[PDB]
């Protein structure tokens, strides 16, 4: 009864720095479609198994999705460090969610480079878990006061990806959706 098609079978996925929230509840959710889709290549799940969650049911089915370069699909795991893992989207510790990813090279790429998907490269601090930062202002490397101009120490933070149909076996952009099943002691707990 939960529209799992819209989150899974959509058309436009935003970039990692503009990852899309998708809150979902108030249904009965069927997982057999996720059981044996025969197309996901990296179905991995932490804390709670998906073969046996059918009995139990809470709220907080917080789940999101984006598109990301293939290799770093391993870097999305609690207690794991990396460039995008630290710097664009980082899981907390004590995980309870469930990661799913699959290849979509056939459609989300155009010869010559599809310059639409970008990702942050640096940040002064390191982000807290499950928080979003979107900001396009310049980076001031050194002691030069920079207001709105680009220079030897003023650099554009956001950088564009490179997607090719004939890219490397990890260089194609995969689609990633991660679900996260939690609970709260408050009443009015809608099941699934």
């Amino acid at each position, epitope marked *: 009864l939960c529209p799992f098609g819209e989150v899974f079978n959509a058309t436009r996925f935003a970039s990692v720095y503009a990852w899309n929230r998708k809150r979902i509840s108030n249904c009965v959710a069927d997982y057999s479609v996720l*059981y*044996n889709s025969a197309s*996901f*290549s*990296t*179905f*991995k*799940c*932490y*804390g*709670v*198994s*998906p*073969t*046996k969650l059918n009995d139990l049911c809470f709220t907080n089915v917080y789940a999101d999705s984006f598109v990301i370069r293939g290799d770093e699909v*391993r870097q999305i795991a609690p207690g794991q460090t990396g460039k995008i893992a630290d710097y664009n989207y980082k899981l907390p510790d*004590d995980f*309870t969610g469930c990661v799913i990813a699959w290849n979509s090279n056939n459609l989300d790429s155009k010869v010559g480079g599809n310059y639409n998907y970008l990702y942050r490269l640096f940040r002064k601090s390191n982000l807290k878990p499950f928080e979003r930062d979107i900001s396009t202002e310049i980076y001031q490397a050194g002691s030069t006061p920079c207001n709105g101009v680009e220079g030897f120490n003023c650099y554009f933070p956001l950088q564009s990806y490179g997607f090719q149909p004939t890219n490397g076996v990890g260089y194609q952009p995969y689609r990633v959706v991660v679900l996260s099943f*939690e*609970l709260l002691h408050a009443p009015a707990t809608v099941c699934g």
Partner: antibody
Amino acid sequence: TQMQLVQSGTEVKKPGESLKISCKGSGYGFITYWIGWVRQMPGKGLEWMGIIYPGDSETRYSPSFQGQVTISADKSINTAYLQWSSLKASDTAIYYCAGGSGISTPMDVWGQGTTVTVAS
Amino acid sequence: DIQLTQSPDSLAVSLGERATINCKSSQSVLYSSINKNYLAWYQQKPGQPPKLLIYWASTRESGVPDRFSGSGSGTDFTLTISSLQAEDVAVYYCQQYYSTPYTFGQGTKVEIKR
């Protein structure tokens, strides 16, 4: 049941050489299954040596078994393998490959296990 | 690493009564959000691979009757078998799976008394 786990047959070797054993799974939903390995001495309990994932070959080892046992996976025929570099006299025991969906999950489905010894 | 212990190693009880086994941990095994213990109770007859009996320390795996039960909290738990059968002679094991790696107990041996 919905998952079938099979292993290799019983086979023993003299000490010094290597050792090649394998564990295979079959059925629906296997893509969400991790493979772990358990050891039993004759007349004793269980011990854990390693766990692995079939797809991306992520490995985790016991604190007391690094270097002596090699864990490998292959997603093409969708199985897992265990290697022994050198064999001692104290490596005569019964080993189980077992399956568990996810990490921090009950170790529910099991194979039959295989035994290894050393003698003349 | 988390350590366990079981008691008794061996037990002697007649047919058709209650039998007990106690398993204690080294640290707390409770997970914060999900208030369910990450323990497991296994049965293994001679010449047999193990068959899971109790998962999550309080929930019954499909294919076994009600005559087995588990209780406890914190770091101490107990599994009790009621109205045993002659078939109920095996080796019973407690093992947690809170985090990498897991450690089993020493083992429990049941035996009919007459």
